[PDB]
Design a protein around this ligand. Structure first.
Ligand code: HEM
Ligand code: HEM
Ligand SMILES: Cc1cc(N)nc(CCc2c(F)ccc(CCCN(C)C)c2F)c1
Ligand SMILES: Cc1cc(N)nc(CCc2c(F)ccc(CCCN(C)C)c2F)c1
Ligand SMILES: C[C@H](O)[C@H](O)[C@H]1CNc2nc(N)[nH]c(=O)c2N1
Ligand SMILES: C[C@H](O)[C@H](O)[C@H]1CNc2nc(N)[nH]c(=O)c2N1
Ligand SMILES: [Zn+2]
Lengths: 411, 407
């Protein structure tokens, strides 16, 4: 079968055949679409078909499908699976798997970069201190004095699910949040639960509005341990506005390196439960979501006050006015400090080019419109007008439950 | 199978049981989600009639009553005999209101029960259709205190006698391809503007020419009619801060009235059913004015604002966009024409959703269409999970008539 997607701004029509290689479920049925739902242990039984499929993909990409190396590798993985119940990826396969998990991430607007990913093999790690050292080197390499470089560090794969490697942080760099007795929140409200865990584990919290959280690292299913990222490795950007000199007095900053650390990387049926990856920000992640979500820092009111907008009626669009100015300030500050950032116009335009290229060279590009379209100015970016097919390919990044809900504490 | 939807801004969780009553299909499968795709006989009819009558008599608390069974019997006998059937006035009103209630892409549905239904099923000619449409337009406009309305022309019979309004909206601006290569007026309507000229219209070739009506009764050739200008309420667009904004020469019309959809009630098909409500500001300010394939005025507004259009990262488009949408709301409000900003309308829809989940067990909703095309995440609907499914009675798309008309 062939499926067509249409861009309703340009009338470009693209034909998807890649969806035929989709295995996992979407959550939708013929009778209900779960397209806007946020969130829609493995034996030798199912593992070799998952392995074989990945290895067929791998050897096809290197133009070696059917070769002796291909057949021998399948043979080697088969015996290793029956002998040991799992298998180990070659370095080349790990690199390929990690790049394609990013390439397959249908919610990621930044995938034009998928092939320039620095893969750090951390599968020889055994302890939380070792994890901290790998993560520090990741942070230093990826930050690169503001000239950000995409990187992923891959810790040992799951075995029996009782010895998991986990980074308990959702992101490697993230600000603490503190629930005050009066009900207000100091810092990032999205991080209150994790902040409280860190404090319980012995973190001495500064209790400021932009405290970089400690790393909480779990090696081999042991209880997690706390580590402070060297501050010299944490690049931060004070937020000022190019016209509004009072904007700096809001006291805002953000960190430069977005590094997701709580997802699971699936490659050939293997599960990498600790695989922190990082790229660079699209401005709206900070300016729109982090700063202006009602349940995040929520600065719209105070910004709109300082701008002296008509805040009595929503139809003055005072929220939309402030939102743009905040987002100008984020992009201005990062560029002024020469820290890599991309605005939503550039990023969406690149994604369209990437997506068209993928359809031509690959037969498709799974894309989740709900997530691709930026959270401001949606229809003046070209992704808004682009029809997209969402389906799940492997290798893939998957969600996993927060470890404090599953972890069996040693004491 | 009893599904939950979470609002991630408020953690409010709603349980959806209404989706199990869904009938038609979404276009999605377990292998592929098509959520962002724009457009995915006597034996067929009586189950459709029975399903609708069942929900109707349940809605009036007479399910399983003699009146229910008799009507089921009566319609059953009518389909057996005439191969179709006719809705009582009460069922037609209920069916139309519920087609709006079920429009999963409509953010305005909190108003669904206050719909004025104009029964036009006695209409036989395009002139008669014109008369019904002028009355609709005048009633709905109401001197700018807009009121929701639908006018329902006779139902499809053998598909050769279809009633169709060829316009996509009762009121829309013409589009002309210039010899110069550009487009004057609304580019979205260039093709329809051609068919009006091809059928005899005398185009003023302006930037905001109200298109004439192209009305088709009983499958005959469509006929041109000019809506009385005194019935077409328009709002000149000025900014409450930029005096130069008036010189852009922008106006829009007050009455959004979709005329090309198909209303399905109890298996019956109403191919001509223009309905109207009132605008959300962003439809005009974001889509009509700022889409690249439409009036596409961002450049000119940004220039007048003297924004730095050298780099996208100055967010000059975003700044201009906000101001254009401030002007649209300000202009409609100042002229006392009903309009709703995207903040109010999405807040109302959240309240509507909660109302529907409480009193109905669900609300089918299409996130891709419900979230406004600007400032998405600062509106509550962005953080609202939504289940999309197809309920009937429903509004449906249909082929453009010129592609089908046996001339
Ligand atoms: C290099 C620059 C990058 C940019 C500009 C970018 C942009 C984005 C944005 C804006 C989102 C939406 C996230 C949100 O709203 O919270 C996203 C999602 C995502 N990104 Fe990228 N990204 C980049 C790099 C990467 C890399 C290096 C990876 C992995 C190796 C990655 C994997 C993902 C995944 C898996 C998601 C979806 C998360 C989910 O499924 O919920 N991205 N990306
Ligand atoms: C009264 C105020 C109303 C408001 C503010 C409103 C708002 C909207 C908006 C913004 C859209 C997206 C349309 C687009 O972007 O082109 C929409 C879609 C829609 N509206 Fe409403 N609407 C209203 C009244 C009505 C009425 C009275 C009906 C029918 C009786 C209706 C039926 C629909 C349908 C069927 C769609 C989706 C069409 C599709 O499936 O693609 N609306 N509405
Ligand atoms: C690598 C990278 C680049 C970039 N531009 N931004 C980020 C942070 C955003 C982001 C992702 F991308 C991917 C995943 C998550 C976690 C999702 C959290 N959700 C469910 C509330 C994320 F929060 C990371
Ligand atoms: C009754 C009403 C209220 C309001 N606020 N706006 C409108 C016009 C938008 C609109 C709809 F709502 C419903 C349907 C269409 C047609 C769809 C056009 N698509 C496919 C480009 C529409 F274009 C109509
Ligand atoms: C309910 C809805 O699915 C949820 O709010 C989604 C919408 N789209 C998004 N898109 C991005 N990029 N990031 C998000 O967190 C979300 N949230
Ligand atoms: C491709 C995509 O489905 C298309 O651009 C949609 C997106 N969401 C929309 N939402 C609304 N309200 N109106 C639209 O026309 C569209 N267009
Ligand atoms: Zn779907």
């Amino acid at each position: 079968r062939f499926l067509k997607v249409k861009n309703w701004e340009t009338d470009v029509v693209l034909t998807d055949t890649l969806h035929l290689k989709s295995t996992l479920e979407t959550g939708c049925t013929e009778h209900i679409c779960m397209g806007s739902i946020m969130l829609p242990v493995r034996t030798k039984d199912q593992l070799f078909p998952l392995a074989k499929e990945f290895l067929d993909q791998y050897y096809s990409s290197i133009k070696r499908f059917g070769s002796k190396a291909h057949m021998d590798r399948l043979e080697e993985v088969n015996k290793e699976i029956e002998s040991t119940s799992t298998y180990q990826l070659k370095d080349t396969e790990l690199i390929y798997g990690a790049k394609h998990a990013w390439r397959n991430a249908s919610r990621c607007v930044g995938r034009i970069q998928w092939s320039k990913l620095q893969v750090f093999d951390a599968r020889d790690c055994t302890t939380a201190h070792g994890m901290f050292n790998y993560i520090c080197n990741h942070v230093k390499y990826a930050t690169n004095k503001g000239n950000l470089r995409s990187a992923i560090t891959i810790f040992p794969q799951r075995t029996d699910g009782k010895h998991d490697f986990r980074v308990w942080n959702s992101q490697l760099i993230r600000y603490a949040g503190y629930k005050q007795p009066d009900g207000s929140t100091l810092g990032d409200p999205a991080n209150v639960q994790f902040t409280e865990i860190c404090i319980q584990q012995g973190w001495k919290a500064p209790r400021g509005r932009f405290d970089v959280l400690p790393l909480l690292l779990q090696a081999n299913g042991n209880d997690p341990e706390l580590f402070q990222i060297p501050p010299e490795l944490v690049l931060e950007v004070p937020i000022r506005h190019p016209k509004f000199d009072w904007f700096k007095d809001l006291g805002l900053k953000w960190y430069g390196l977005p590094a997701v650390s709580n997802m699971l990387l699936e490659i050939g049926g293997l599960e990498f439960s600790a695989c922190p990856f990082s790229g660079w920000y699209m401005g709206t992640e900070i300016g729109v979501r982090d700063y202006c979500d009602n349940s995040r820092y929520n600065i719209l009111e105070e910004v709109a006050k300082k701008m002296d907008l008509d805040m009595r009626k929503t139809s003055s669009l005072w929220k939309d006015q402030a939102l743009v100015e905040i987002n100008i300030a984020v992009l201005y500050s990062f560029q002024s400090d020469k820290v890599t950032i991309v605005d939503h116009h550039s990023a969406t335009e690149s994604f369209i080019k990437h997506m068209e290229n993928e359809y031509r060279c690959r037969g498709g590009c799974p894309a989740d419109w709900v997530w691709i379209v930026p959270p401001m100015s949606g229809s003046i970016t070209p992704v808004f007008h682009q029809e997209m097919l969402n389906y799940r390919l492997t290798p893939s990044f998957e969600y996993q439950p927060d470890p404090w809900n599953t972890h069996v504490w040693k004491g």
